[PDB]
Design an enzyme around this catalytic site. Sequence first.
Site, PDB file in Angstrom:
ATOM      1  N   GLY A 123       0.776  -1.384   0.047  1.00 23.43           N
ATOM      2  CA  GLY A 123      -0.372   0.023  -0.257  1.00 23.43           C
ATOM      3  C   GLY A 123       0.446   1.627  -0.238  1.00 23.43           C
ATOM      4  O   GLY A 123       0.223   2.231  -0.254  1.00 23.43           O
ATOM      5  N   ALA A 124       2.015   1.145  -0.087  1.00 22.00           N
ATOM      6  CA  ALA A 124       3.187   2.498   0.878  1.00 22.00           C
ATOM      7  C   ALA A 124       3.493   2.748  -1.455  1.00 22.00           C
ATOM      8  O   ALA A 124       3.136   1.842  -2.031  1.00 22.00           O
ATOM      9  CB  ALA A 124       4.692   2.492   0.828  1.00 22.00           C
ATOM     10  N   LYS A 125       3.952   4.213  -1.229  1.00 20.18           N
ATOM     11  CA  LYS A 125       4.127   4.311  -2.816  1.00 20.18           C
ATOM     12  C   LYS A 125       5.958   4.326  -2.458  1.00 20.18           C
ATOM     13  O   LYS A 125       6.307   5.355  -1.287  1.00 20.18           O
ATOM     14  CB  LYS A 125       3.835   5.639  -3.392  1.00 20.18           C
ATOM     15  CG  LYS A 125       2.258   4.977  -3.055  1.00 20.18           C
ATOM     16  CD  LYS A 125       1.722   6.052  -4.525  1.00 20.18           C
ATOM     17  CE  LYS A 125      -0.277   6.417  -3.772  1.00 20.18           C
ATOM     18  NZ  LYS A 125      -0.629   6.772  -5.273  1.00 20.18           N
ATOM     19  N   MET A 126       5.887   4.023  -3.732  1.00 16.66           N
ATOM     20  CA  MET A 126       7.730   4.309  -4.006  1.00 16.66           C
ATOM     21  C   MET A 126       8.504   5.358  -4.457  1.00 16.66           C
ATOM     22  O   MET A 126       7.720   5.185  -5.461  1.00 16.66           O
ATOM     23  CB  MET A 126       8.212   3.051  -3.900  1.00 16.66           C
ATOM     24  CG  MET A 126      10.101   3.108  -4.214  1.00 16.66           C
ATOM     25  SD  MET A 126      10.788   1.469  -4.374  1.00 16.66           S
ATOM     26  CE  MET A 126      12.230   1.287  -3.503  1.00 16.66           C
TER      27      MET A 126
ATOM     28  N   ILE B  15      10.034   7.325  -7.774  1.00 15.73           N
ATOM     29  CA  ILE B  15      11.116   6.323  -8.205  1.00 15.73           C
ATOM     30  C   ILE B  15      11.769   6.585  -9.164  1.00 15.73           C
ATOM     31  O   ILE B  15      12.548   6.280  -9.687  1.00 15.73           O
ATOM     32  CB  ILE B  15       9.681   6.671 -10.367  1.00 15.73           C
ATOM     33  CG1 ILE B  15       9.893   5.550 -11.115  1.00 15.73           C
ATOM     34  CG2 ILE B  15      10.119   8.020 -10.761  1.00 15.73           C
ATOM     35  CD1 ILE B  15       8.955   5.478 -12.516  1.00 15.73           C
TER      36      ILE B  15
ATOM     37  N   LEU C 274      18.292   8.826  -4.209  1.00 16.95           N
ATOM     38  CA  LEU C 274      20.073   8.469  -4.458  1.00 16.95           C
ATOM     39  C   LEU C 274      20.356   7.244  -3.822  1.00 16.95           C
ATOM     40  O   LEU C 274      20.394   7.096  -2.791  1.00 16.95           O
ATOM     41  CB  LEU C 274      19.984   9.800  -3.618  1.00 16.95           C
ATOM     42  CG  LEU C 274      21.513  10.302  -3.621  1.00 16.95           C
ATOM     43  CD1 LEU C 274      22.115  11.078  -5.039  1.00 16.95           C
ATOM     44  CD2 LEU C 274      21.826  11.246  -2.789  1.00 16.95           C
ATOM     45  N   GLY C 275      21.691   7.200  -4.877  1.00 15.38           N
ATOM     46  CA  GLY C 275      22.324   5.787  -4.240  1.00 15.38           C
ATOM     47  C   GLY C 275      23.041   6.446  -3.435  1.00 15.38           C
ATOM     48  O   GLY C 275      23.994   7.681  -3.535  1.00 15.38           O
TER      49      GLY C 275
ATOM     50  N   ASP D 266      18.773   5.483  -1.051  1.00 17.50           N
ATOM     51  CA  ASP D 266      19.125   4.001  -0.807  1.00 17.50           C
ATOM     52  C   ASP D 266      20.440   4.235  -0.281  1.00 17.50           C
ATOM     53  O   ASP D 266      21.087   4.038  -0.691  1.00 17.50           O
ATOM     54  CB  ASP D 266      19.554   3.677  -2.300  1.00 17.50           C
ATOM     55  CG  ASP D 266      19.807   1.764  -2.393  1.00 17.50           C
ATOM     56  OD1 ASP D 266      18.649   1.015  -1.857  1.00 17.50           O
ATOM     57  OD2 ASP D 266      20.624   1.197  -2.191  1.00 17.50           O
TER      58      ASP D 266
ATOM     59  N   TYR E 156      28.643   0.710   2.912  1.00 21.51           N
ATOM     60  CA  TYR E 156      28.837   1.195   2.279  1.00 21.51           C
ATOM     61  C   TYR E 156      29.889   1.897   3.718  1.00 21.51           C
ATOM     62  O   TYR E 156      30.092   2.812   3.401  1.00 21.51           O
ATOM     63  CB  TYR E 156      27.474   1.998   2.046  1.00 21.51           C
ATOM     64  CG  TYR E 156      27.048   1.521   0.698  1.00 21.51           C
ATOM     65  CD1 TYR E 156      27.146   0.204  -0.299  1.00 21.51           C
ATOM     66  CD2 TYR E 156      25.393   1.587   0.243  1.00 21.51           C
ATOM     67  CE1 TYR E 156      26.041  -0.821  -0.912  1.00 21.51           C
ATOM     68  CE2 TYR E 156      24.562   1.459  -0.948  1.00 21.51           C
ATOM     69  CZ  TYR E 156      24.944  -0.070  -1.250  1.00 21.51           C
ATOM     70  OH  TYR E 156      23.940  -0.308  -2.160  1.00 21.51           O
TER      71      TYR E 156
ATOM     72  N   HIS F 149      20.545  -8.484   1.013  1.00 23.98           N
ATOM     73  CA  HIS F 149      21.223  -7.430   0.410  1.00 23.98           C
ATOM     74  C   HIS F 149      21.473  -8.741  -1.278  1.00 23.98           C
ATOM     75  O   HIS F 149      22.078  -7.858  -2.562  1.00 23.98           O
ATOM     76  CB  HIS F 149      22.374  -6.742   0.250  1.00 23.98           C
ATOM     77  CG  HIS F 149      22.959  -5.932  -0.041  1.00 23.98           C
ATOM     78  ND1 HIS F 149      24.576  -4.714   0.500  1.00 23.98           N
ATOM     79  CD2 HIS F 149      23.459  -5.492  -1.458  1.00 23.98           C
ATOM     80  CE1 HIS F 149      24.384  -3.603  -0.352  1.00 23.98           C
ATOM     81  NE2 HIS F 149      24.146  -4.452  -1.041  1.00 23.98           N
TER      82      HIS F 149
HETATM   83  N1  LIG Z   1      21.720  -3.708  -4.589  1.00 20.06           N
HETATM   84  C1  LIG Z   1      23.056  -3.653  -5.125  1.00 20.06           C
HETATM   85  O1  LIG Z   1      23.832  -5.230  -4.912  1.00 20.06           O
HETATM   86  C2  LIG Z   1      23.663  -2.343  -4.948  1.00 20.06           C
HETATM   87  C3  LIG Z   1      25.086  -2.465  -6.002  1.00 20.06           C
HETATM   88  C4  LIG Z   1      25.358  -1.774  -6.473  1.00 20.06           C
HETATM   89  C5  LIG Z   1      24.763  -0.587  -6.269  1.00 20.06           C
HETATM   90  N2  LIG Z   1      23.406   0.016  -5.779  1.00 20.06           N
HETATM   91  C6  LIG Z   1      22.790   0.859  -5.978  1.00 20.06           C
HETATM   92  O2  LIG Z   1      22.949   2.057  -6.619  1.00 20.06           O
HETATM   93  C7  LIG Z   1      23.906   3.001  -6.845  1.00 20.06           C
HETATM   94  C8  LIG Z   1      23.651   3.823  -7.817  1.00 20.06           C
HETATM   95  O3  LIG Z   1      25.038   2.669  -8.674  1.00 20.06           O
HETATM   96  P1  LIG Z   1      27.323   2.426  -8.763  1.00 20.06           P
HETATM   97  O4  LIG Z   1      26.656   3.740  -7.258  1.00 20.06           O
HETATM   98  O5  LIG Z   1      26.913   1.637  -9.145  1.00 20.06           O
HETATM   99  O6  LIG Z   1      26.645   3.783 -10.174  1.00 20.06           O
HETATM  100  P2  LIG Z   1      25.969   4.558 -10.834  1.00 20.06           P
HETATM  101  O7  LIG Z   1      24.908   5.515 -10.295  1.00 20.06           O
HETATM  102  O8  LIG Z   1      26.207   4.137 -12.385  1.00 20.06           O
HETATM  103  O9  LIG Z   1      26.914   6.227 -11.297  1.00 20.06           O
HETATM  104  C9  LIG Z   1      27.240   6.794 -10.260  1.00 20.06           C
HETATM  105  C10 LIG Z   1      28.797   7.669 -10.846  1.00 20.06           C
HETATM  106  O10 LIG Z   1      28.017   7.825 -11.903  1.00 20.06           O
HETATM  107  C11 LIG Z   1      28.696   9.218 -11.541  1.00 20.06           C
HETATM  108  N3  LIG Z   1      27.710  10.394 -12.315  1.00 20.06           N
HETATM  109  C12 LIG Z   1      26.145  10.385 -11.883  1.00 20.06           C
HETATM  110  N4  LIG Z   1      25.782  11.548 -11.939  1.00 20.06           N
HETATM  111  C13 LIG Z   1      26.789  12.242 -13.416  1.00 20.06           C
HETATM  112  C14 LIG Z   1      26.322  12.488 -14.289  1.00 20.06           C
HETATM  113  N5  LIG Z   1      25.659  13.926 -14.392  1.00 20.06           N
HETATM  114  N6  LIG Z   1      26.692  12.624 -14.979  1.00 20.06           N
HETATM  115  C15 LIG Z   1      28.548  12.219 -15.476  1.00 20.06           C
HETATM  116  N7  LIG Z   1      28.461  11.371 -14.148  1.00 20.06           N
HETATM  117  C16 LIG Z   1      27.477  10.807 -13.377  1.00 20.06           C
HETATM  118  C17 LIG Z   1      29.078   9.330  -9.989  1.00 20.06           C
HETATM  119  O11 LIG Z   1      29.785  10.832  -9.801  1.00 20.06           O
HETATM  120  P3  LIG Z   1      29.906  11.600  -9.213  1.00 20.06           P
HETATM  121  O12 LIG Z   1      29.578  11.154  -7.322  1.00 20.06           O
HETATM  122  O13 LIG Z   1      31.387  11.775  -8.695  1.00 20.06           O
HETATM  123  O14 LIG Z   1      28.977  12.387  -9.132  1.00 20.06           O
HETATM  124  C18 LIG Z   1      29.430   7.959  -9.813  1.00 20.06           C
HETATM  125  O15 LIG Z   1      30.708   8.007  -9.982  1.00 20.06           O
HETATM  126  C19 LIG Z   1      24.200   2.918  -5.849  1.00 20.06           C
HETATM  127  O16 LIG Z   1      24.870   3.533  -4.991  1.00 20.06           O
HETATM  128  C20 LIG Z   1      23.649   1.690  -4.132  1.00 20.06           C
HETATM  129  O17 LIG Z   1      23.230   2.905  -3.837  1.00 20.06           O
HETATM  130  C21 LIG Z   1      22.991  -1.550  -5.379  1.00 20.06           C
END
Ligand SMILES: NC(=O)c1ccc[n+]([C@@H]2O[C@H](COP(=O)([O-])OP(=O)(O)OC[C@H]3O[C@@H](n4cnc5c(N)ncnc54)[C@H](OP(=O)(O)O)[C@@H]3O)[C@@H](O)[C@H]2O)c1
EC number: 1.1.1.21
Length: 315
Positions: A9-12, A14, A17-18, A43, A48, A110
């Site tokens: 029932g909650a809204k996430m 879309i 921020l990672g 997220d 981390y 995870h």
């Molecule tokens: N559940 C899992 O197993 C899992 C695994 C991996 C990731 N994740 C989640 O997903 C999130 C995103 O994935 P990710 O961290 O792997 O990488 P991503 O979001 O694909 O890429 C991040 C990189 O892109 C750069 N960036 C961001 N916006 C940009 C833009 N507008 N122009 C140019 N470069 C840009 C960032 O630089 P700056 O920071 O220097 O700006 C950083 O170096 C993670 O942070 C995490 O929260 C979950």
Amino acid sequence: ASRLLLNNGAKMPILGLGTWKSPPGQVTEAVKVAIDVGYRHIDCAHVYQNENEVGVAIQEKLREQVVKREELFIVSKLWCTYHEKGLVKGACQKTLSDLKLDYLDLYLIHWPTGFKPGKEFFPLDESGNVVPSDTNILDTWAAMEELVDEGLVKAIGISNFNHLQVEMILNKPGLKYKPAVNQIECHPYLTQEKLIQYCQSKGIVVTAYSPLGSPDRPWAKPEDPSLLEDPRIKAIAAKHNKTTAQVLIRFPMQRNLVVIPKSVTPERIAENFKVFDFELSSQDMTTLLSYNRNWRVCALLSCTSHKDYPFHEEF
Ligand SMILES: NC(=O)c1ccc[n+]([C@@H]2O[C@H](COP(=O)([O-])OP(=O)(O)OC[C@H]3O[C@@H](n4cnc5c(N)ncnc54)[C@H](OP(=O)(O)O)[C@@H]3O)[C@@H](O)[C@H]2O)c1
């Protein structure tokens, strides 16, 4: 709208921020800027090693009255060394303490793989490989369902589960709470059509992580492929007068996916938010899907022999 309805029932929101690889020293400012810009979903994960500093930022904005807690959607994840039924609660309470919250909106397993408990996140067998726990996915799901009944989390989900592991939970005798979300890697080079179609047909919302191809991932060898620099994706962005990153964030949104780009840079956090004002055509979407090459950023390569490794199956 910017929100997708969950099975509880909650809204996430879309767009979120990672925070993987966001340094402790820069992530408090980054989350503050993101909330000011209009982000309402963050997220997070224990592994981390920056949830305390993320929690400083949320407290600050809550105290400021920029946002109320009910409009924030905070996500964290159970690390692999805490899959034993008796450790799950403790792992969740540690995250809640660090984030300074009294409940989580969504808590994810995870990875499907359990590792032996201890202080090392990837325990090694004196010598070489990662030491597994003998716990299984259903034991850990039962411990996660207790967190909902105790009021610590509003919804529970999974991350990096292949379709057979999801089907394992869906067929659990006495299943009380279905996974609300499956968070998986997804971008033009790993489009995930079969796992997204499977999850969406089961009422499970999909979140795309690494949408920009994770250019800051530590193991970045390949010297090859970069999504941000792909001339074919630069051309689609040029046609729309958007940046390549804006096209890459808009692409999962039009597939009804939640997307969580990471940035610690204020100009890029702001850039990444301006994704609700344009539309990719059907032609653009079919073209982006055609770039799939089954290239995976996060393959958990130290665990390829683990009994629960997720990426041997087709999807
Ligand atoms: N559940 C899992 O197993 C899992 C695994 C991996 C990731 N994740 C989640 O997903 C999130 C995103 O994935 P990710 O961290 O792997 O990488 P991503 O979001 O694909 O890429 C991040 C990189 O892109 C750069 N960036 C961001 N916006 C940009 C833009 N507008 N122009 C140019 N470069 C840009 C960032 O630089 P700056 O920071 O220097 O700006 C950083 O170096 C993670 O942070 C995490 O929260 C979950």
